[PDB]
Amino acid sequence: KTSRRGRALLAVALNLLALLFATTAFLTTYWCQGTQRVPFQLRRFHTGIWYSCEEGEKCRSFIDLAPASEKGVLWLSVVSEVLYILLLVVGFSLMCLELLHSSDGLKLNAFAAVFTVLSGLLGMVAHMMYTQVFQVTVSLGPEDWRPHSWDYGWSFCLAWGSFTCCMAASVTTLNSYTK
Amino acid sequence: KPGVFSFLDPLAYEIWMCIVFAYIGVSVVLFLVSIFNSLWFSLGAFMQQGCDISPRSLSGRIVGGVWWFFTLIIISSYTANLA
């Protein structure tokens, strides 16, 4: 019986890690390194997800930009993030109920699995939307800030976090079907 | 032309990361119908058209159809791009 418990708790901790990645990219400090070292003068952008920093050293807001329909894509993006987090927390909650019975089960665990799948389904869409938006932000001449550095930062690790979220989901739900 | 990159060129690396993650997501769904077993079955799904052995609809077989449509679209787009 120690085996199934180790599997379940391991999956719980893994999804907790995924939540840490969720917080990680939800708290991105610079989602893309950036530069415009114009031979003007040298420039180094550091675009946080809601916080376009420049680097003397400075960080700036710059959120909710062009254009309109894209802003709505940001709405769907953030809503998808919130529901993502909700499915996460419901997952951990169903895990805690499993702990309470460790202190349906199957019928409950699979539910969380499903939600976690849904969670994984949403953020992978969400980031697309975000990346979509980001490309669009680059596509429309980003005011002046159009770095050649263009490369992904913190959130990609969160994409892996959604990956291991689906992974731990599959592992614990397999632990459930093994019953 | 770097050995390898030229094949990679028609479709962007990000798109690859996306198709990979998406497939991984599709993969587990078959297991829901039932970490290794049905994931292996999904490995038996991407390899050939899409999914099998479903006792008429059930649940994930329609996922197999959507996945078939999916891989179909992507490979078509790829070939068109290289062309």
Binding site: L118, T131 | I15, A22, V26, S59, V63, V66, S77
Partner: peptide, 29 residues
């Protein structure tokens, strides 16, 4: 990758729909 992302959307949506079907099928039983 956008033009394909639109297909990703229908893919994921089909996934969730099929999941709902799995749910009601778990409801009959």
């Amino acid at each position: 990758l956008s033009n394909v992302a639109g297909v990703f959307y229908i893919l994921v949506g089909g996934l969730g729909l099929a999941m709902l079907v799995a749910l009601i099928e778990f409801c009959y039983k």
